[PDB]
């Protein structure tokens, strides 16, 4: 049975954990320890294809040990998450993009740009600017709310499709 290793990255507080739990369990967790990094597994049906998602919810600390690279390098695809009400989280996307390129040693890594917290009326990041960034990278852009589940299937299933597309090549 097919296993896809997904990795969720992005600034503290963007909603990595809430997005992951929303995908795996179908509810919103508004308080999950910000330091806690863990893998979540779920059997899914995408485009009629049965598979196992193994999703790393990144946290811990910013460090570049051999061991941290090895672990991130096992990811087949990455969700680059920012929050639509946090400009800095949006600017930080380039950092994560660059680290993924470095550890996979490739310009062609399956990635999806995720603008989370789409339910909030305190937007600081233009959807236009977001789309232009995803376009500059050659990757899909999905607006999400972990709170309302808006876009959550779309974000994870899109990334699986990007991985399948990479695995065919």
Ligand X SMILES: *C[C@H](F)C(=O)N1CCN(c2nc(OC[C@@H]3CCCN3C)nc3c2CCN(c2cccc4cccc(Cl)c24)C3)C[C@@H]1CC#N
Does 115 contact ligand GDP by CB under 6 A?
A: no
Does 126 contact ligand X by CB under 6 A?
A: no
Does 6 contact ligand GDP by CB under 6 A?
A: no
What dihedral do alpha carbons 115, 121, 124, 129 form, nearest 10°? 50
Q: Which of 37, 154 has the CB closer to ligand X?
A: 37
Which window, 16-24, 41-49, 67-75, 125-133, contacts ligand GDP (CB under 6 A)?
16-24
Q: Which of 20, 51 has the CB closer to ligand GDP?
A: 20
Residue with tokens 């890594």: 109
What are the residues facing 53 on neighbouring strands? 4, 42
Enumerate binding residues for Mg ion (CB under 5 A). 16-17, 59
Q: Which residues bind ligand X (CB under 6 A)?
A: 9-10, 12, 34-35, 58-62, 64, 68-69, 72, 92, 95-96, 99-100, 103
């Amino acid at each position: 049975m097919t296993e896809y290793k997904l990795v969720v990255v992005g600034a503290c507080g963007v909603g990595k954990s809430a997005l992951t739990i929303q995908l795996i369990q179908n509810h919103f967790v508004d308080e999950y320890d910000p330091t806690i990094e863990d893998s979540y597994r779920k059997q899914v049906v995408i485009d009629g294809e049965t598979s196992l998602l193994d999703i790393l919810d990144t946290a811990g600390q910013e460090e570049y040990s051999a061991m941290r690279d090895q672990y991130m390098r096992t990811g087949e695809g990455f969700l680059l998450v920012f929050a639509i009400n946090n400009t800095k989280s949006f600017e930080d996307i380039h950092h994560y993009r660059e680290q993924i390129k470095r550890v996979k040693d490739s310009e062609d890594v399956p990635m999806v740009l995720v603008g989370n917290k789409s339910d909030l009326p305190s937007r600081t990041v233009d959807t236009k600017q977001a789309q232009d960034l995803a376009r500059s990278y050659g990757i899909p852009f999905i607006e999400t709310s972990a709170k309302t589940r808006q876009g959550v299937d779309d974000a994870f299933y899109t990334l699986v499709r990007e991985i399948r597309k990479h695995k065919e090549k």
